[PDB]
Design a protein around this ligand. Sequence first.
Ligand SMILES: Cc1cc2nc3c(=O)[nH]c(=O)nc-3n(C[C@H](O)[C@H](O)[C@H](O)COP(=O)(O)O)c2cc1C
Ligand SMILES: CCn1cc(C2CC2)c2c(CN3CCC4(CCC4)CC3)n(C)nc2c1=O
Ligand SMILES: O=c1cc(C(O)O)[nH]c(=O)[nH]1
Length: 375
Amino acid sequence: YNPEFFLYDIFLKFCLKYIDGEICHDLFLLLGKYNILPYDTSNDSIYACTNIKHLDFINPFGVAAGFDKNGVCIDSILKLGFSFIEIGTITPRGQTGNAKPRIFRDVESRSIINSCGFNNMGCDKVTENLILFRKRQEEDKLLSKHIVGVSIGKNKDTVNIVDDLKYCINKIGRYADYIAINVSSPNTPGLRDNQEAGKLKNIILSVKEEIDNLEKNNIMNDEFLWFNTTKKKPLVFVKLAPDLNQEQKKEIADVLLETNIDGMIISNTTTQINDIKSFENKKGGVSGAKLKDISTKFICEMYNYTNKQIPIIASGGIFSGLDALEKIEAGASVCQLYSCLVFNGMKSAVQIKRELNHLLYQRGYYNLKEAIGRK
Ligand SMILES: Cc1cc2nc3c(=O)[nH]c(=O)nc-3n(C[C@H](O)[C@H](O)[C@H](O)COP(=O)(O)O)c2cc1C
Ligand SMILES: CCn1cc(C2CC2)c2c(CN3CCC4(CCC4)CC3)n(C)nc2c1=O
Ligand SMILES: O=c1cc(C(O)O)[nH]c(=O)[nH]1
């Protein structure tokens, strides 16, 4: 539909075959930094407009965390045709992450394994970048109504987790539309994180208190306090890992209901996949198609464990419009992509939005919001 997407798709096969994955990522980010990526300025289907409570997404596809970990590429990625982006995961202080090489691709299974280790330049710098973005958003029509969430985590060496989360809120909170709590990374030596119910409940409540406190202590109206899209206080989501037993899943669902979390992103990568030939000697968590079915099941479980009272953000192995519908019919309200962009390139959003629209009419739905859990 656009002559510009195609050139990047041509060079994609070469890069995927010959260039280190992280080098591919750095080059992609540099291209987007200089505003020479393609665009998708078509109007979206009003019947595919989705929402998470009062958060209104123009379409149901965003970019998952870990893509623009530092918010240096926000405009260009969004203008590819996504309704929202999740930057991060960020930590208060910068971190270089694990030793390179740390990202390896298996083209045949369209899978990736990564052991990045929360490499980022730190909250202060990323906050400055998001401020620059919000100022550009005021003057750029192609960014109006677009949503930016911030994924937050902990530095590798931090003793307590709530402290790091509170600092990020107190610096970047008034510029974020939503906050994603990452307690699911496989690349922190503390195996994943304190997803135990007691710790998680206290963590969530502390975050909500810090958000509420930014509001209280100010003289300006809410319009000028929240320099975001909504002009409203940020929502709270949680990012979950797939390597959990049923008791843990049930316990966290009970905690989410008690603490009134605004959403749950299910899920992050898994370290339990052992049938990828090229990754057998590679450390890290695996992303892509091989996580699809696993994550879909997790959606069904939590959607049921939470009595359909907690909205679901789907992440894992989404490549096609059918994949998205599987997530939606399982209980998800919105979808995030990552591996798809690695293997399909610039055309990811346009293709998947068109695919889902066609499938959505075929199955007879008036709109996709009616389809959540409809199977
Ligand atoms: C290189 C790499 C870095 C990632 N970094 C983060 C991160 O910083 N924070 C996070 O919550 N998830 C991170 N993820 C997980 C993705 O956001 C996503 O949940 C997962 O890769 C599944 O997406 P996919 O199957 O479409 O590839 C990362 C994944 C990869 C491959
Ligand atoms: C997981 C790290 N990561 C990241 C990427 C890119 C983020 C999108 C990878 C890519 C695709 N890039 C897209 C753009 C070009 C540069 C000109 C065309 C190709 C590289 N490929 C093939 N592998 C990637 C990877 O491993
Ligand atoms: O949640 C996460 C974090 C990372 C990382 O940045 O190392 N990698 C993943 O695969 N998942």
